[PDB]
Subunit: 198 residues, 4 copies
């Protein structure tokens, strides 16, 4: 069984960048529904798989991608944020960011452009291409997880679903993006990067 992970900090720790109300709703309401529905969907799939029912397996695909992706995406997101984050990364990561994007500022612009640009609900990702051996920016629609649909290893994800910023920033997505850079836990994205730095 999958579980709702605990937040590494209090709901009001990312203030004033992302307010406590969004953090509470996002985690306790949105993420909780994903794991519950994921466990419900996985049990159904186990029933379908055992019967060799291919129709049921295919019909169940959207719910699993949506809920399974929802769980995966949000789980990474909480670890990517920190009340002690912000600033710039250091060491190997910064080294690779300058190499692949030109500069840290250029990387920020690319990821922001990618995030602001998703039409509808989605995610902006900084990922690692294990085949090519470099960093890569990608945008994923709805809850489609990065690794599962793209093959890239997720390092940093930015949720651009409206529930992630509307209460505080309303329709101005760029304001939310400008603000989230102040709480990015570079300590965690450097770890994820090192984990696949092979």
């Amino acid at each position: 069984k999958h579980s709702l992970p605990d937040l590494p900090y209090d709901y009001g720790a990312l203030e004033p960048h992302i307010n406590a109300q969004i953090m509470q709703l996002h985690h306790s309401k949105h993420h909780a529904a994903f794991v519950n529905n994921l466990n419900v969907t996985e049990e159904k799939y186990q029933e379908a798989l055992a019967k060799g029912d291919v129709t049921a397996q295919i019909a169940l695909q959207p719910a699993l991608k949506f809920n399974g992706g929802g769980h995966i995406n949000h789980s990474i997101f909480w670890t990517n944020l920190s009340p002690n984050g912000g600033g710039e990364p250091k060491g190997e990561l910064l080294e690779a960011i300058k190499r692949d994007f030109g500069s840290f500022d250029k990387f920020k612009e690319k990821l922001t452009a990618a995030s602001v640009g998703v039409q509808g609900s989605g995610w902006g990702w900084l990922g690692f291409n294990k085949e090519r051996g470099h960093l890569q920016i990608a945008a994923c629609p709805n809850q489609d997880p990065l690794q599962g649909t793209t093959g890239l290893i997720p390092l940093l994800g930015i949720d651009v679903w409206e529930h992630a910023y509307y209460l505080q920033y309303k329709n101005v997505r760029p304001d939310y993006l400008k603000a989230i850079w102040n709480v990015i836990n570079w300590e965690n994205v450097t770890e994820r990067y090192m984990a696949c730095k092979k």
Copy 2:
């Protein structure tokens, strides 16, 4: 040139079902951006078309569908709502609703299920199938317009993008749906129905 249509009522007229803040942001901010970007996108397309630049035409497709759909969808939506709406439709429409869905209650359930069920951003629609000659329920992702992507004539649309209900109903989409039935302008959906009742 396309224009931002005026609302048929004051921003606070649909209260307490849909509050004035959502109505103001939704119309003055969201819809306004769609027409502006649509006009910008259409001019670009006219440049591409004149040059016979097929690459530019294809690259421009998402922006036109998103912004063009955005304009179309929201324009219909404002006419579908009214401070004097609610209740049940009468005459021909009600007659066709019972015929195609069993009862008005059954129709409500079907459209609600369709609307609550869109994964991500989208719309729930009551449309008319001119080929088959009956009413049909459909769900469209993001801003993909009903007629243009499906062929069905739009009668009643329900916006399930989070910006349409989050400030007031938060994550509980069903609450928003339960509430919107009280402001549905059946007078307008009966007109749209009669317009294609051929």
Copy 3:
């Protein structure tokens, strides 16, 4: 497991409408490949689910739908064809066709148009809509199965992948469709129909 079903007639039984070469290749090579890969994908999916690896489950989705759908679709297709086929259906199926499509001829035109109209690889389908109690024509891309992705119950399917007709009819898909009507197994289509009008 899943196994390649034996054809209920020999490869040359549908001549001159569909030649023996196509039938042999379609069954022994194309369909066979789908079951082999379906078995492998299912085994991998079982592995992933036991370990709760949501990323692996999502990564396997395209393969499962394509190979599972390939098996499902072709398995129905073989039963939809017959050396004893052709003509028109009798009884209830025919009544339902007259009611839903105007006549059998109008139905022939519509299914033909939907098949000839698929861009790329795909299938043309006459399906049953359990929810509305009526017949419906739908087109599915590549190997996406009708029931698993649409909810409709498959009755008659027309494979419009180029491999189903190219050797004999080259690029002329309409010639292939005109010839397929002579081998449609209406006894089977009726059989499938009676099964869902329950």
Copy 4:
């Protein structure tokens, strides 16, 4: 307007690798159909845009992309092949291939794998990523053009629609791909490469 380009060699010039029958059908029938329908779709799109009919513009999108892409793709494809082709590229293109893919052999494997791997109809592409300054392999479904849907600049394209190889290689796509390497026009691919490294 758009016109069917004359082949820069006769239909039997690529034998025994790609037979004359395929070349004749591919150019005179398949490609010709795309330009005819592209011209009609463009004319209809001009009508729609002049009238500001956003619904008609969106309804024409699938046709424009499929037929426009069909013209673009096949037009590049013909120039990518040559009776004088084969072997390996020289100079900068080869250097870029060694740098980005390890070697020419590894590059051959990757493009072959991406082509053989497309489910249904599509294309395998070696493209140029202007933003990152490197070579990249991509696969496009049906007739979706590389630049218009991906932003990458096309250098070499491999048509994996069954009509490009079925008559000669039947279902064995790997045989077709092994043979196509003998007629690749590296002078043209280099030409396209030099054009974007500007």
